[model samples]
Target: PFRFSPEPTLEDIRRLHAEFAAERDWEQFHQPRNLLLALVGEVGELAELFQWKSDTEPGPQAWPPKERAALQEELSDVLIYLVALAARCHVDLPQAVISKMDTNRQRYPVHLS
Candidate 1:
């Protein structure tokens, strides 16, 4: 169902989010500070699912199977904020990711280390 169309790339996320923000006049609230805070909160929510679990806690005390579903939702929340923030900042999310990866690879040159 996820690939009902084609690539679910940044363009799709950016376009749909812009439409959503405009429809509800939410762009104003999409300020960098607000979005960043919300993104952090969503990240925390995702982390909360695993808090204090054993390192090997795919154990019986682990979160129930439905935590998988909750994890997916929380991940989506963090991703949406990234695309929304990128669009608002006029940065291309996909390319920016690629660029950052390239920079990180150079920063960690095994050729030298």
Candidate 2:
């Protein structure tokens, strides 16, 4: 119902996650605020991955294989929580993103220097 009919897209994750929670009967704890806080917590966990780093200028590709693997997990956790939060809040994320980006396009015009 959110207008995304593409294969392997955000709606895919949304539908899969919805069923995951329903199967576990954990929807009670998946309210907007709760999921938002959980998202923050996952982000904190992700930050911990870089806690002692002083220089990461080359980006995550320069990280060790194990670190990269763990980063993938943490990043997925953050996204999962975010999508879940949006679902609980009745937000169509893809539509919202397009609208917001359109607003940004108008608000911040190209600097044709």
Candidate 3:
């Protein structure tokens, strides 16, 4: 399993971007539009992995053993690409998530949906 220790920080994301750049010479492809497109593509791949699953459906227990693990890995791959895309755009992902949650909470108060 890929575990992030002490949670990930901005510095960690920067390092990950640097490593990606060095390993694949991908800096030229880190433009906002390209990264956004890649992120969407990865999300599409992830969705395809579980194409017909229903919201009430149970987890991987319903899937074949080997396929279950592979599906989980694909989900992780999508998340990794999302993180990398955020880093490429100089976004503070964690903070952005928290801020959006706060906005959502206000928009959809507990009394409502």
Candidate 4:
């Protein structure tokens, strides 16, 4: 029983995501195709935040409070969609993470001569 409270984790997000959609009878909208599109849109929104960035000329310490807050929400939106999509497909988030790490390493394996 995942109580939507504090102390967040991958497991908590998975449980909460299922419960949220189930409670609202929105499972029909959770198809992989639909979720993938939604996740991409979220990523686009997050990326837009850095469209004007060049480096740390005026880091967050110099950025306006409003810009800083917007960045946080955009980042959160991207992560929420990722977790939600993983939950919809019954994919093990931690397992996928480890597998991806291993797969990527091999894909870009070191070439020592």
Backbone clashes, each candidate: 0, 0, 0, 0
Worst 10 residues of 3 by lDDT: 24-33
lDDT of 3 by residue, 78-108 (tens): 6666777777777888789886999997898
Provide the overall lDDT of each model, using Cα atoms, as 2-decimal numbers: 0.75, 0.80, 0.70, 0.73
Residue range 1-113, candidate 1, lDDT tens digits? 34444667778887787778776656464676676677789898878866766777574334575777778777888888877888889898778888699999789887744
Per-residue C-alpha lDDT of model 4 across residues 47-72, encoded as one tens digit per residue: 87777786757764478878778777
Model 1, runs deviating above 4 Å: 1-6, 27-29, 59-65, 111-113
Residue runs of model 3 more than 4 Å from their true location after superposition: 1-6, 10-14, 54-58
TM-score of each: 0.77, 0.80, 0.71, 0.72
* CA error at residue 33 for candidate 1, angstroms: 2.5
Tell how far residue 55 is off in model 2, in angstroms.
Answer: 4.6
Q: What does candidate 2's lDDT look like per residue over 1-113, in tens digits?
A: 44834765777777777778787757454567777788898898899987877675556778788888888778988998888888777789989999699999889998986
Regarding TM-score, does 2 or 3 come out ahead? 2
What clash pairs does model 4 have? none
Candidate number with the higher lDDT (1 or 3): 1
How displaced is residue 18 in candidate 4, in Å? 2.3
Q: Clash pairs of candidate 1? A: none
Error of 1 at 23 (Å): 2.0
